[PDB]
């Protein structure tokens with residue numbers, strides 16, 4: 529008896545350092561295409577249809593960025609948010625350090641009781657030889673899975689998930705978990 533069931537409307541906001549793949553993740557989820565050439569700064573106004581656990585959900589995808597108008601305006605995205613995707617890049621230890629230093633304080637300031645899914649994107653670079661050589665110059669290496677899980681535990685995230693927007697692996701699962709968190 530599923531036809532004629534009213535949809536549940538939820539709002540998702542995605543935040544994180546520039547270039548970690550926030551917009552690419554939204555486009556892969558929304559359009560099943562990894563944007564290869566002309567990716568905008570933000571992917572705005574989209575509302576995704578997603579069914580999880582027999583509930584039909586309309587999930588508004590709010591993209592954010594970090595420069596000029598986007599930085600001063602970003603706090604305007606937070607009202608009435610039902611779930612947060614907080615993204616770092618596995619090829620960027622610095623983007624992980626900003627999770628506790630910047631993103632968690634900001635999100636806890638504007639969205640105090642909203643569930644946070646911590647997302648490690650670009651997991652395809654974990655074994656990319658060029659990535660390893662560039663990070664090795666800095667005595668660094670790609671973020672390890674246990675390092676992401678540990679950060680998720682520290683910030684009290686609803687969960688930790690790893691993605692490659694590029695291969696699309698894990699992307700669907702992130703938004704499904706985020707929809708469940710939103711239904712709380």
Ligand SMILES: Nc1nc2c(ncn2[C@@H]2O[C@H](COP(=O)(O)OP(=O)(O)O)[C@@H](O)[C@H]2O)c(=O)[nH]1
Pocket residue numbers: 544545546547548549550551552553563564567568569649650651652653691692693694695
């Ligand atoms: N290898 C790889 N590159 C990615 C991935 N996700 C995004 N990118 C690239 O990372 C850069 C930033 O992407 P964008 O989606 O613009 O990041 P945003 O600034 O967080 O919105 C672009 O060059 C994307 O093609 C991923 O999973 N793997």
Ligand SMILES: [Mg+2]
Pocket residue numbers: 550551552568569570571591592593
């Ligand atoms: Mg973007």
